[PDB]
Amino acid sequence: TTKYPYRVCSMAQGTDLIRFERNIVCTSMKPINEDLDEGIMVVYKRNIVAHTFKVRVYQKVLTFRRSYAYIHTTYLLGSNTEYVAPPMWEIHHINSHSQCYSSYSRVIAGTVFVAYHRDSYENKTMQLMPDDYSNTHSTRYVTVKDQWHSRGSTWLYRETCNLNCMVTITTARSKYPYHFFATSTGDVVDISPFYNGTNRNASYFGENADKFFIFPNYTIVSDFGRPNSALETHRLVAFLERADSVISWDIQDEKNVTCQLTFWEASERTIRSEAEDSYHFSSAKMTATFLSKKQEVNMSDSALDCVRDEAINKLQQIFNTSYNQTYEKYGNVSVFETTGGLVVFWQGIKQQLQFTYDTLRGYINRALAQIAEAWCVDQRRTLEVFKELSKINPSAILSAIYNKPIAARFMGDVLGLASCVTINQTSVKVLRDMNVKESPGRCYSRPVVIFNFANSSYVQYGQLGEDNEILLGNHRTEECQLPSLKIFIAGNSAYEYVDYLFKRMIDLSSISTVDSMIALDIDPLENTDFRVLELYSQKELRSSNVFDLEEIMREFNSYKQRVKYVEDKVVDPLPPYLKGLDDLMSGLGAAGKAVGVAIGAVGGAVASVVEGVATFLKNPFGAFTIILVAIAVVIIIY
Amino acid sequence: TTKYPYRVCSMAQGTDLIRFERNIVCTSMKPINEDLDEGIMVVYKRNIVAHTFKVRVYQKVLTFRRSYAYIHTTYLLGSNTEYVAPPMWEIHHINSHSQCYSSYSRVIAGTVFVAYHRDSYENKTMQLMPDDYSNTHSTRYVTVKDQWHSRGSTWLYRETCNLNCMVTITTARSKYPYHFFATSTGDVVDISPFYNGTNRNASYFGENADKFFIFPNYTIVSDFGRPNSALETHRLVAFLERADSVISWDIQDEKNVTCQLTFWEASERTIRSEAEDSYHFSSAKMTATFLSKKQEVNMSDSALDCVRDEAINKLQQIFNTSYNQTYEKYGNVSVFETTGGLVVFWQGIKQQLQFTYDTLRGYINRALAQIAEAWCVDQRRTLEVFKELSKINPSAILSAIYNKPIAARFMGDVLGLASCVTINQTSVKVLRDMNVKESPGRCYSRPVVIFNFANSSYVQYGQLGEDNEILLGNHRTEECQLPSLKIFIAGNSAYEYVDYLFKRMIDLSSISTVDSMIALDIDPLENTDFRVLELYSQKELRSSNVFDLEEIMREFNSYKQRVKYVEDKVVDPLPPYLKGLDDLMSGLGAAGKAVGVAIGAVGGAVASVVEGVATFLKNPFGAFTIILVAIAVVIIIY
Amino acid sequence: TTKYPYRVCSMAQGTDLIRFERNIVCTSMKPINEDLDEGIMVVYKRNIVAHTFKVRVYQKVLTFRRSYAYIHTTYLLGSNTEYVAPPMWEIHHINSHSQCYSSYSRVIAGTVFVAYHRDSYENKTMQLMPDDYSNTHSTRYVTVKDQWHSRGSTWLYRETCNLNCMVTITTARSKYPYHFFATSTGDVVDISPFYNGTNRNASYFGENADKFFIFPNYTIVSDFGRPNSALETHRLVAFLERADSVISWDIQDEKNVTCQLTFWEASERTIRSEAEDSYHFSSAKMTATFLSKKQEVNMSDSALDCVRDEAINKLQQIFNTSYNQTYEKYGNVSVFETTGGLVVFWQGIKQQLQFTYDTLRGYINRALAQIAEAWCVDQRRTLEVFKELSKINPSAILSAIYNKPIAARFMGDVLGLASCVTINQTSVKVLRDMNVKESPGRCYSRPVVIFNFANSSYVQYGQLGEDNEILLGNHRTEECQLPSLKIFIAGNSAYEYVDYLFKRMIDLSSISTVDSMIALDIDPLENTDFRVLELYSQKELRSSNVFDLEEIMREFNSYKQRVKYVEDKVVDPLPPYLKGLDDLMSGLGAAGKAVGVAIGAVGGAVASVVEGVATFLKNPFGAFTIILVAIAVVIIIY
Ligand SMILES: C[C@H](NC(=S)Nc1ccc(NC(=O)c2cscn2)cc1)c1cc(C(F)(F)F)cc(C(F)(F)F)c1
Ligand SMILES: C[C@H](NC(=S)Nc1ccc(NC(=O)c2cscn2)cc1)c1cc(C(F)(F)F)cc(C(F)(F)F)c1
Ligand SMILES: C[C@H](NC(=S)Nc1ccc(NC(=O)c2cscn2)cc1)c1cc(C(F)(F)F)cc(C(F)(F)F)c1
Ligand SMILES: *[C@@H]1O[C@H](CO)[C@@H](O)[C@H](O)[C@H]1NC(C)=O
Ligand SMILES: *[C@@H]1O[C@H](CO)[C@@H](O)[C@H](O)[C@H]1NC(C)=O
Ligand SMILES: [Ca+2]
């Protein structure tokens, strides 16, 4: 199954942005000049090359966790992490020996608080070792992989720190005009990658003054994790100290320039309707409809000399492709610059009753041009439709219209693209179970999977999706209602779960496609389900009533009811008006005209005293005192 | 940015209704008559003009609010509003002096309860002043804009009223045959606007008998709010006392009639396939396919004499547009009434080897007609697709297919249309923040905006949407996970929030459209995110696990789990079976055969006594008594 | 209204499976051979007939319910059902006399527990009577329709059983190659319906060995429910004892075989572009584009002799349909097998300046073929679009593209089809109310309906949907905000609810379709709503703020906020860290350096004692003891 390998792509950061431009206008191609020409043209747009240069990021996560230890259990009373960038000497030590210290020494506005890794009060060094989230364009070298659950002595509230020095090596990508590069994780900095010390006017720079360091001949270790690797001196290295991280990169070298060509497509039949100055290339591809101004762009122009020779030959071959001797060439090659920005160039071609033949050919050409002109609108319609379908599942739409497996994610108003991460591909066991072990009456919705990220030894838990791609998480449970005939696609083979235990594998042949079933299927059987009906017709339709199986329709008819559930449910365990007071309303609810005022005043005084009494009673020491005095009185009775 | 002004259109009442008719059928245009004609026709449908006449509505909102006042805080023990229509003399006073009373005097079935504005027990008068929700088709003149939070004396439960006399001036719209008009706010009445006293048979009337008043020469003030304006006597005014409002309007005058024409479109090439009686106008616009019966509609007909002359000239000009002398006219103009109801009229045109030319022309015409016939189906398909896309975002779909900014809202099964309200356009500050100030760890999803409704001085709070339109509310928060690169479109300029603090404005050029990127993009970068992965692989995937960023797909896989959350969460703080009883089950849960019965009986008696004891204990006076007796006993020990 | 009868189709089990195959490829039809032919062909695909044979299923549901009875109310302390298949002798008794016993006698691993229907300790017999869920393809004969709410003696915890013997008669459907048949309810078994005792190699069998019984001449009662019906001896009957049911069926007889033909369609104009071996039938239907290998399939083949004669005649008639004498036949009929698997057969046809005419005809044919070739892609695009629209409402999409009323439901990755159940059609009262009677401030979203399932006398409750089809449940409530103008479609007639009380019926003519309104509507009115605005601009936008009326858009902007509501709401009434302990954190929260440790230790000891004291206090007997000793001490004071 090399066609569809396991992939966990549901996450996509920046470095790629695409949009769905709203307004595109089609023309009205019947102003003048019922007579018209035809030739052979080839089309290509303008593109720019990006740059990838493998930045590095240093960071140090420190978290406090305070807890209390009972005799048999240990309660955690909350925890809080925070990220702080390391000082410069620590970064020098990291880049020189691939080991970092275990004592952070920040100062907060009046004095220093020397934190420690394990409250051991030592200045030791810790190595770096690989982490369990690898890629082809990412790596980590965290130094404390585990978490510390030290129970400690009973009845002793104590707090601990977990300094977790880390280095990561991502790959960034910047585009023209090269004045901000976004890394793989998501960090964005407004500095040109080509900015060395003395290129302020030529290359952009807008970050800060004393947050920038350029080092020449910086001895950097080749690969972290190995205790003693081999060093290698780079030319220039740049550091960009931020408030919570440190970014570093190699000062890149000057860019190569060849030209901007794409080779969009090469057509074979075009139609030209010259109105007055707006030569229309009504191409017969039914997807190309351009416009240009009636001026040759001077083929000997100083912006396209790479394709200058390559411009001619292809046209010639396409001529010899189909126009051997019946069709004769007409003039030299011509070059037109369109309104969009793409250069398109073409070669003209041509071939009593001769007048009749010419009239027939002209009429047919006019008909075809008008048909294409009317066809122009469905492209606008399709873009409009996709602009709304992309709100349901961007990944599917983009992968369908690009013919590549692509993971995309919304970023407010513009999509962000990325490829798919690839799992080990060897150890992925699909459990033959769907029932939640702990909870009776609830079973998973999609089979649970246990994959393993590359170059690691730590298992995970995800759930199978469509086309054999893993989606993260283990929380797609659902109440479930026997019998069931779930079938999951892993093309070209489908799993068949019957009553939630893995009946058998089935080859994908006994499920007729709707496309091949446009004709009359014999007859639907009109089946029924009795558990759901018996549950509805006893009025406890709360949880198992429906699972919204036809989701996006049946789901929005119920949401306004869940909102009321949540509101009413929240109001009761939400701080009331001093629940003891809640009776007074009922006291006035029944009857009473003016006794209510005096009753309210007396109740106010009484409640003022009793609330203090109860507040004293709630502390354990006060409760013990009450118990002691009660026992003492009872003993005194004797 | 005059192209896209700020607008707050997310609300749309009636007065406009549109539908998505399901079944439209395409024909089979090859019965007979392979030979066929062609001409030039122009098409227009039938429309009717509406009527807008600026009704007025009087109302009086009165609300009770009861509260208790502690020493440092004031609790509100609920409140309730209610709307009541004012009596007739109050309306006369309002329309004569633009000031209304402050004492409502309803009777409830046995006696009168004279309410008062502030329990001041006076019969004063209050002026009317403008409200903070204006429009081009709405206004209000509320008399008490604020709310009364009078603390009052401590320890005194008291209730207050807030009589809030109001008048509003909307604009209604009614359509043929003029027998019900719906106002802007949403009120609908079944009375023809032309119904004066003596038009029962000619104009509809179906509301009631003693709920209608017609006044001649009613002295009405010109504009409320000004203490002394200039009066103006209208001809007839009508009042329609309802149970909770009073509607009034001017008795309109008799309608003008000219004709019903639309000028749908003017084509240039048509194709006619006369089968036996069903002349088919297979127009070359690829969107027009009509049918009619083989009978001229008698151009000298008494329903279209306005366009009678205008019918001919346009055809002539289009002839001179393209048919100078090669194409000769054929007969007189002809008029056909289609099956839909639209009248279409046309002028016929025409021009050894002549037979060959005729055969070629006929074959080409047949081919084009068949192509259009096959094209007829995609319109049905597109309507079917839009019928389901309209369930995702009606406003976007309707604005796309109408090329106007339109706000629409479902009304059960039929859409309701309206334009967009326009804000002051001058003072709209977009805050450069996204973090919720009070709650740490939660930050907004779209930037928060502070606009200002026209002709007011009271700020509001809304959130920015797409294409620079404000959507109401301040509640789109979300847990959020650094780093972020949010980009919001305000065409043609996009805001860029990096880590939720307003990095900088960016011109909309560095985001390549997918339409212009049909070709091969270089390569996606395969990025990753470590915070989400570390959160998943420790099994606390509850709140920050996912935000359903690719919403409508990832959202319905989780809904059945939120349902279980809500159910289990509700069950516990929901009235149990007298929680003291809950132990008995466990008492029988472990073991026991027949001791359970006796234990249950004894527990029943004990619980019967103890519940009464606890009910006595819960009142503050009983608690104070218990405290007093305990202290007295302890003192007595001494 | 026979066009749209009431139907309750929202449920669909298996027995029908369809799929949405992803990749379909269009060709490039310009390799070679600019010259090309044309003929007349007819097309039909391959289909297989299914089998329906009316299985039977026996089952016995037994449920335990334990409860306690107070003096005025009766609490139920949970209940649990379970399904168990009956033994063989009980099934023999059921099939011989249509009455079943009331005493289940299972054994659990060490001894028998004889359950009883009502703890009456008797071995009586109970009849079978019809149930209130009937169909054309389902029935039930449950023996205990009601539920037992016997109050019993006060203060006596007791449990009861409700044995509910049942038999059902569904209809299954199996398809080629007949090796698993799925019943209507949802049960699936992997046995060929034709498997009698001695067909192991010819017919599949994969269930088990000692879970199968074949009985010859089994005297089976004709119809259950009647105390004494007429018997009828079938040939062979098969039982398939499962763990919780018993399935039975008649051993079917050998299948008939005629042929596999469908008669897809009969075209009239085709275009053939023979490249080298891949004759392309570029049909002019604009939906047919095939491919085959250059070899006749030997019309005298032993797989299609049924249509062998019928193959010729239709072609002939279509010739006489349009080709009388101008068009002459060319050779004999030819038969081509396509790549898909469908056989298509065709008859060729044909008809100085002759060369010119031939060139014109060839050029036109090439143009039309290229247009169809370019058209091939929109079918792929439409399938891609429907693959995502089917995630919103499968029923609507399938019913639109099949032109039949079809209820479909997702089954993981493949759709399941069924027709619509039909209600009595006579007694369906649509209540003229929408306000929830018990709850003030909440009113239904769609009108509530009271239908009645066929052949029953037990009312139900459902809600009206679109196109006059009932959807089950009574839980689509919503907070609601006057005024309202709801209009519900029951084509061709719409209900109009104004302020939620059934204003009047309206014929469907005063709502203009968007399809007929492509032109300029006069002007939208720009209406407004004041209740919603006043609710927003006072900051209590929690429940009535919005109902997500434009659902699928406004709904996913709020979901991440409901998630936080649920999380925060759950955390508080979720088992805390022994709430008495919660103070210690605040004790260390303010200040303290080392007194916290000693305070924590003392608090630990005190809490250890006090928790035991409170646990003793929570039992009713301990509370009564405390009350007794307190009263005794107070009396002793005297
Ligand atoms: C009928 C009477 N009801 C009272 S006195 N209701 C009440 C409740 C609350 C407040 N005030 C505040 O809650 C408050 C908060 S801040 C300021 N005031 C004031 C009055 C009653 C009194 C007794 C007694 F005499 F034994 F106490 C027992 C019962 C019994 F047996 F039915 F339970 C009933
Ligand atoms: C094991 C025994 N358990 C009992 S007696 N359980 C029980 C609970 C509830 C009910 N009945 C109702 O709740 C009821 C509601 S309406 C009608 N009846 C009846 C019985 C037990 C008794 C004592 C004692 F003697 F001190 F009380 C202390 C403990 C201790 F130390 F473990 F806590 C345990
Ligand atoms: C300020 C002082 N606060 C204390 S002592 N706080 C505290 C709370 C909890 C724990 N420990 C555990 O909860 C625990 C669970 S497991 C192990 N330990 C330990 C200490 C205080 C003491 C009194 C007194 F003396 F009357 F009691 C009254 C008040 C008053 F008037 F303000 F209410 C305040
Ligand atoms: C280079 O940068 C300097 C900044 O000091 C600027 O003044 C100058 O115009 C730029 N260009 C050249 C050619 O020096
Ligand atoms: C029939 O089934 C038997 C199973 O014992 C198998 O050995 C045999 O090959 C099958 N076919 C024939 C023709 O006997
Ligand atoms: Ca199309």
Residue numbers in the entry:
A (entry chain A), B (entry chain B), C (entry chain C): 86 to 436, 483 to 769
Direct quotes from the study:
We stabilized prefusion gB on the virion with a fusion inhibitor and a chemical cross-linker, extracted and purified it, and then determined its structure to 3.6-Å resolution by electron cryomicroscopy. The molecular model of prefusion gB fits well in the low-resolution electron cryo-ET envelope of prefusion gB on the virion, confirming that the structure represents a prefusion conformation and that the stabilization of the prefusion gB by the fusion inhibitor and chemical cross-linker did not substantially distort its overall structure. In the model, prefusion gB forms a tripod that is approximately 100 Å in diameter and extends 110 Å above the viral membrane. The central core of the ectodomain is formed by three trimeric coiled coils centered on the threefold axis with an N- to C-terminal polarity toward the center of the virion: one membrane distal in domain III (α3, yellow), one membrane proximal in domain V (α7, red), and the TM domain, which is embedded in the viral envelope (α10, olive). The legs of the prefusion trimer are formed by the peripheral, globular domain I of each protomer, which has the fusion loops at its membrane-proximal tip (blue). In the prefusion conformation, domain V residues 639 to 669 from each protomer are sandwiched between domains I and IV of an adjacent protomer, “tacking” domain I down to the central core. Domain I is further constrained by the interaction of multiple aromatic side chains (Y153, Y155, Y160, W240, and Y242) in its two fusion loops (between β3 and β4 and between β9 and β10) with the amphipathic α8 and α9 helices of an adjacent protomer’s MPR, which forms a “scabbard,” shielding the hydrophobic tip of domain I until it is unsheathed to insert into a host cell membrane in the extended intermediate. The interactions between WAY-174865 and gB are mainly hydrophobic and aromatic, involving multiple hydrophobic residues, including Y153 and Y155 in the fusion loop; L712, L715, I730, A738, and F747 in the MPR; and P751 and F752 in the TM. HCMV strain AD169 escapes inhibition through mutation of residues homologous to strain Towne G734 and F752 (18), which are WAY-174865 binding residues on α9 of the MPR and α10 of the TM, respectively. The visualization of a fusion inhibitor bound in the interface between the fusion loops, MPRs, and proximal TM domain shows how the inhibitor stabilizes the prefusion conformation and provides high-resolution data that can guide structure-based drug design.
